[model samples]
Target: MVKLTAPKSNVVAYGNEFLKITATASDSDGKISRVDFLVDGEVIGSDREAPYEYEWKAVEGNHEISVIAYDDDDAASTPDSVKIFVKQAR
Candidate 1:
């Protein structure tokens, strides 16, 4: 089993601003090959190691962020997602 944790949510951003979102993936089987970070159903980044994080160029509006972990056996776990909100800076 795999679990994903989002440390940041309900974020606000300005133009061309970078949002540092951190996701933690844990596997009960203790073998996580990689974790994919997605924004609005599109893959943005991936990490093969622990402490998986992504520096996203946040756009103004609502977005869905999700993470899916794949084990070494090519097994995919259920997606974990959260809603993010950004506002354009005036």
Candidate 2:
């Protein structure tokens, strides 16, 4: 099974002005070729290789984020996601 996970479950609101969204994807039988990040349903950023990382901006309110990973054989893994709230005043 392929897996994707972030380093931290939550981030500080004030320091999230321009934080990096980092994730690692790995598969037992195949190589992870790409990973993409989405907000709502629109893609915000993507990486074509492993150890993918992208810069993300959190405005205000809660944000829904998701990621999809693909292997070299074109086999894809189920998308994973998380929701974190951006403080209204931070």
Candidate 3:
């Protein structure tokens, strides 16, 4: 099981090109292997340890960012997603 707690939903990231996204996860029967960071359904990076985090440099637009946790068995947890509006400096 997992939850995304940063870069809250419906965020307006004005003038912010680089953002840190974080997730909390746990695996009862196994161990957490990694947390996949994705934007617009495309994976951007992954974290293999606690305080799961990824740095995202976003272009100006609307985007759906999400994180999915994978266990040691490589089982994916349901994704936790958020919508954000990025307005980077021109």
Which candidate tops lDDT? 3
RMSD of 1: 2.0
Q: List the candidates' TM-scores in order.
A: 0.82, 0.72, 0.90
lDDT of each: 0.76, 0.69, 0.87
lDDT of 3: 0.87
Candidate 2: worst 10 consecutive residues by lDDT?
Answer: 1-10
Task: Write one digit per residue (lDDT tens) for candidate 1, span 33-52.
Answer: 88888889899998887788
Model 2 per-residue lDDT tens digits across residues 1-90:
334465254866643476566667878786787887876656898898666877777667777667778888877678777776666655
- Runs in model 3 lying further than 4 Å from the true structure: 14-16
Candidate 3 versus the native: TM-score? 0.90
Better of 2 and 3 by TM-score: 3
List the candidate 1 regions with Cα displacement exceeding 4 Å.
1-4
What is the clash tally of candidate 1?
Answer: 0
TM-score of 1: 0.82
Clashing pairs in 2: none
Q: State which candidate has the highest TM-score.
A: 3
Number of the candidate with higher lDDT, 1 or 2: 1
